[PDB]
C-alpha cells in the first residue's frame, strides 16, 4: 500500500505455521502481554480480529542471537556512575540484575542526583532501591515500541486501544499526488523512509552533471560516471501508483547517503502520508452525527486529496481441437462504430478512453471459417485511460507456457477524487466517513475571512480517551502561525527547560515531539500566548486556543468561541467506488441452482438463518416464501416471474426448490429409503414434468448479456 506497510510486513513475528499454534486451539495465556516482552516485542501493534495476540512486531533496538533468542541493549552503570559501554542481554540474563529507567536524573557526570531510583526486578515487579546495586540502565525511552508506533505524537496521552487502531490504520493510507510533510511530527519519519527503500540514495560523493525527469547522472571524484533510472507510473501489488521524482539541481554537490529522488509517500526524504487541514471542533446541524465528517469544496477544486489507481487486464490465445485462435479485428458481422479505437493488429490504441462494455482485444475461436467471438471487454463499473500494452508471441522467441501462442496485457489508469463515503483518519484513532461536502461560501470562517477545511464533532472525544489530537491541534496552530517568546527581562519560568532555537520560530515551521520525551502541557500553554499576528496586526486565536467564528448561511456570529487549529489527515484505502454492488439476475451455480457469490461475478446476498428468525418473528409468511423459493431455487418459477413482471400481469405461485431434491438424492445414495407420501399412501414420484418451456421472449433472463 505504501512504504510503511511494506517495511512493517517484514520485522513481523508470527506464532502460527507448521509447528506452531492454531486459531481455536490457542487459549488466552499466549495472546497476552508478558513482562519479558519489554524491549523485544511491542505491546501495542497487533491485529484486532481472530489473530489478536498471535502476531506481533519486533522492537526498534532488538536483534537476534545466533541461537534464536531476542536481545536488547543496556547501558552499564558501575559504582553509581553510568558508563557508555553497551551490553546486549537476553531475558534469562536480564531477570538476574536490577535495571534502572532511562529518565533518571544524571548529574552531567554519571552520578545519580537522587539516591533512590526506580528499577525493574526479577518477577516484573517495580520497587525503589538505593543507587548502590543498580547495574544496568535503559538506553533510551521508546525502546519498547515498534517503528509504526513511534510515529504517533503525544502517545502517552492516548489509551491503548486508540493507539493500537491508529498504528494499524497508518499502513492503509494511499499515496497522494503531492504528499506534503507534517507540521508537527516525531523524529522517526526520516529513517523509516531511507531503510524502506522507496527513495533513491547516492552511493558515492560527486557532482551532478545533468538532470531530467527520467534519469540522473552523477560524476564521481575519480572521473567515473553513474546514472540512475526512475520508475514512472508503476503499478503496485495493491493497485496504487509508485512514482519517483528528482529533488536535485544541475550543479548541486551530493554526498554518500544523500537522498537524490523521492518516492510514493515521501517529501524531501521524509515519510508523508497525509495533509494539513484547518480544523474546527463543534457540532454542525447533524451532518457530523456519529463519527461523520463535513468537508470543504476547496479540497476538490485544488485536488488536495487525489490518487491515481491502475488496473491490469490479460488475455491469451490457446490451441483448440477445431483449430487455433487468433487476434484480429475481424469480429463476425458487427457494427463499425465500435471498432474505431483498435489498431491494425487488433488492440486498443494508447490514450483512448474506455467505458464499461468496450472491446480491448479482439479474439475469435473456432466453434463446433468456424468463427465465434470471445473478446476482452472492460468489466462492469470500470473506466479509465489505456496507458500501456505488452505483447509476447511464441514465434518471436518467447518462453511462453504450453499450448499458448500470444499473451497481451493492457493497463488502465484513473484519477480518483474525494467524495461521499470515502474513509478518512488521523494518527490517534480517529476514523469516519465523509457525510457532506460543503460549498466554500457556507462554511464557518474566521474574522479575516478564512474558511475552515473540516469539522469534527465534540461528542466522540472525551468518552474514547484520545486527547492527543487536541494537543496536536494546539501545537499545529502554534507551529503554522509562528511564535516568539518575549525575554527582555530574563527568561520566563515556564521556558527554563526549553532549548535554544526554540524561543523564536517563523511561519510554517516544522517541529518534532519524540514519543515519550516531548512538549509538556506547561510549554504548550506558554507558547499559545506568544504568537505572531497575521498579515494585519490581529490575533485570531486567544490564549486558550479558541477563536470567534461567523456562520456562513445566516451571517450572525456564533455566541461562544470554538477550538481551531491544524491537524494531519490521511486518506484510507476504503473507497465507496469499490464497495457498491447490485444485481437483478445473473449466473447460477451448477449443483444447487442458487445465485453465485461475490462481487467479481454477479452474485447475490446471503439471507442467512438469523434473518429467517427475524422474518418469522415479524409474522411475514409470504415474503419469506417468495425469498426462499422464487428468488433462489425455483428453476421453473424464475422465468415465469420475469415474464409476468415484463408483461404486467400477476406474479404466479411458487413451486418446489432444488436443494430439497438434491438432499433426497444424497439420502438415497447413503442407502436410506426416503419417500414422500400423500393422504392415502401412494408415494409421489417427484419427477420433473413434461413442460412446454418454449422461450416466447428470447432475451436471456440474466445468466448472460446481450449482443446484436
Amino acid at each position: 500500500n505504501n512504504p510503511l506497510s511494506g517495511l512493517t510486513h517484514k520485522r513481523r513475528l508470527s506464532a502460527l505455521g507448521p509447528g506452531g499454534l492454531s486459531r481455536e486451539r490457542a487459549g488466552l495465556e499466549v495472546r497476552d502481554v508478558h513482562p519479558s516482552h519489554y524491549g523485544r516485542m511491542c505491546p501495542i501493534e497487533t491485529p484486532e480480529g481472530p489473530n489478536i495476540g498471535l502476531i506481533g512486531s519486533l522492537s526498534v533496538y532488538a536483534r537476534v542471537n545466533p541461537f534464536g533468542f531476542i536481545e536488547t541493549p543496556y547501558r552499564k552503570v558501575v559504582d553509581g556512575v553510568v558508563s557508555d559501554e553497551i551490553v546486549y542481554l537476553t531475558a534469562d540474563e536480564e531477570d538476574r540484575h536490577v535495571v534502572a529507567q532511562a529518565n533518571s536524573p544524571i548529574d552531567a557526570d554519571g552520578r545519580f542526583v537522587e539516591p533512590r531510583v526506580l528499577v525493574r526486578r526479577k518477577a516484573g515487579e517495580v520497587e525503589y532501591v538505593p543507587s548502590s546495586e543498580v547495574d544496568y540502565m535503559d538506553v533510551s525511552p521508546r525502546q519498547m515500541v515498534s517503528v509504526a508506533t513511534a510515529m504517533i505524537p503525544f502517545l502517552e496521552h492516548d489509551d491503548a486501544n486508540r493507539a493500537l487502531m491508529g498504528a494499524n490504520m497508518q499502513r492503509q493510507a494511499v499515496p497522494l499526488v503531492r504528499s506534503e510533510a507534517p507540521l508537527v511530527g516525531t523524529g522517526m519519519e526520516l529513517r523509516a523512509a531511507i531503510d524502506a527503500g522507496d527513495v533513491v540514495v547516492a552511493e558515492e560523493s560527486g557532482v551532478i552533471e545533468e538532470v531530467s525527469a527520467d534519469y540522473i547522472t552523477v560524476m564521481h571524484d575519480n572521473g567515473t560516471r553513474r546514472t540512475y533510472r526512475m520508475r514512472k507510473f508503476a503499478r503496485s501489488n495493491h493497485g496504487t501508483c509508485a512514482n519517483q521524482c528528482p529533488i536535485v539541481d544541475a550543479g548541486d554537490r551530493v554526498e554518500a547517503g544523500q537522498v537524490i529522488a523521492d518516492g510514493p509517500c515521501t517529501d524531501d526524504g521524509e515519510m508523508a502520508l497525509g495533509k494539513n487541514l484547518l480544523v474546527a471542533i463543534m457540532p454542525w446541524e447533524g451532518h457530523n452525527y456519529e463519527d461523520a465528517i463535513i468537508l470543504s469544496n476547496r479540497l476538490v477544486e485544488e485536488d488536495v486529496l487525489t490518487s491515481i489507481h491502475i488496473e491490469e487486464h490479460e488475455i491469451d490465445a490457446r490451441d483448440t481441437k477445431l483449430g487455433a485462435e487468433e487476434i484480429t479485428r475481424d469480429i463476425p458481422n458487427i457494427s463499425d462504430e465500435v471498432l474505431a479505437d483498435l489498431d491494425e493488429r487488433g488492440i486498443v490504441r494508447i490514450g483512448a478512453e474506455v467505458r464499461d462494455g468496450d472491446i480491448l482485444v479482439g479474439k475469435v475461436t473456432p466453434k463446433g471459417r468456424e468463427v465465434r467471438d470471445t473478446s476482452l471487454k472492460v468489466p462492469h463499473g470500470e473506466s479509465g485511460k489505456v496507458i500501456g500494452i505488452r505483447v509476447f508471441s511464441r514465434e518471436d522467441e518467447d518462453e511462453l507456457p504450453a499450448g499458448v501462442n500470444e499473451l497481451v496485457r493492457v493497463y488502465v489508469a484513473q484519477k480518483r477524487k474525494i467524495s461521499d463515503g470515502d474513509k478518512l483518519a488521523g494518527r490517534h484513532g480517529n476514523k469516519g466517513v465523509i457525510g457532506k461536502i460543503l460549498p466554500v461560501e457556507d462554511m464557518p470562517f474566521l474574522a479575516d475571512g478564512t474558511p475552515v477545511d473540516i469539522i469534527l464533532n465534540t461528542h466522540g472525544v472525551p468518552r474514547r480517551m484520545n486527547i492527543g489530537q487536541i494537543l496536536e491541534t494546539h501545537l499545529g496552530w502554534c507551529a503554522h502561525s509562528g511564535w516568539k517568546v518575549d525575554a527582555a527581562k530574563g527568561v520566563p519560568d515556564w521556558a527554563a527547560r526549553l532549548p535554544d532555537e526554540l524561543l523564536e520560530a517563523q511561519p510554517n515551521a516544522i517541529v518534532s515531539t519524540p514519543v515519550f520525551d516531548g512538549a509538556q502541557e506547561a510549554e504548550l500553554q506558554g507558547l499559545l500566548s506568544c504568537t505572531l499576528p497575521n498579515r494585519d496586526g490581529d490575533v485570531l486565536v486567544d490564549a486558550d486556543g479558541k477563536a470567534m467564528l461567523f456562520d456562513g448561511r445566516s451571517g450572525e456570529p456564533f455566541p461562544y468561541p470554538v477550538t481551531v487549529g491544524y491537524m494531519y489527515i490521511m486518506k484510507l484505502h476504503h473507497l465507496v467506488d469499490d464497495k457498491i454492488h447490485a444485481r437483478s439476475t445473473g449466473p447460477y451455480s451448477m449443483i444447487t441452482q442458487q445465485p453465485l457469490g461475490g462481487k467479481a461475478q454477479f452474485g447475490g446476498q446471503r439471507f442467512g438463518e438469523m434473518e429467517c428468525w427475524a422474518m418469522q418473528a415479524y409474522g411475514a409468511a409470504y415474503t419469506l416464501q417468495e425469498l426462499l423459493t422464487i428468488k433462489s431455487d425455483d428453476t421453473v418459477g424464475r422465468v415465469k416471474v420475469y415474464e409476468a413482471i415484463v408483461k404486467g400481469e400477476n406474479i404466479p405461485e411458487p413451486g418446489i426448490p432444488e436443494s430439497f431434491k438434491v438432499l433426497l438424492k444424497e439420502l438415497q445414495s447413503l442407502c436410506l429409503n426416503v419417500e414422500v407420501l400423500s393422504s392415502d399412501g401412494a408415494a409421489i414420484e417427484l419427477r420433473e414434468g413434461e413442460d412446454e418451456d418454449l422461450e416466447r421472449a428470447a432475451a436471456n433472463l440474466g445468466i448472460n448479456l446481450s449482443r446484436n
Binding site: 533510551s140 526524504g269 532555537e501 520525551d517
Partner: peptide, 21 residues
C-alpha cells in the same frame, strides 16, 4: 542529524541518545 542532507526539524526532547537506531 547523521544524514548528509536532512531537513531541519527542531526537537522538544530533553535527553540525549547514546545509541543510534
Amino acid at each position: 542529524n547523521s544524514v548528509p542532507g536532512a531537513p531541519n526539524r527542531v526537537s522538544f526532547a530533553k535527553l540525549r541518545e547514546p545509541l543510534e537506531v
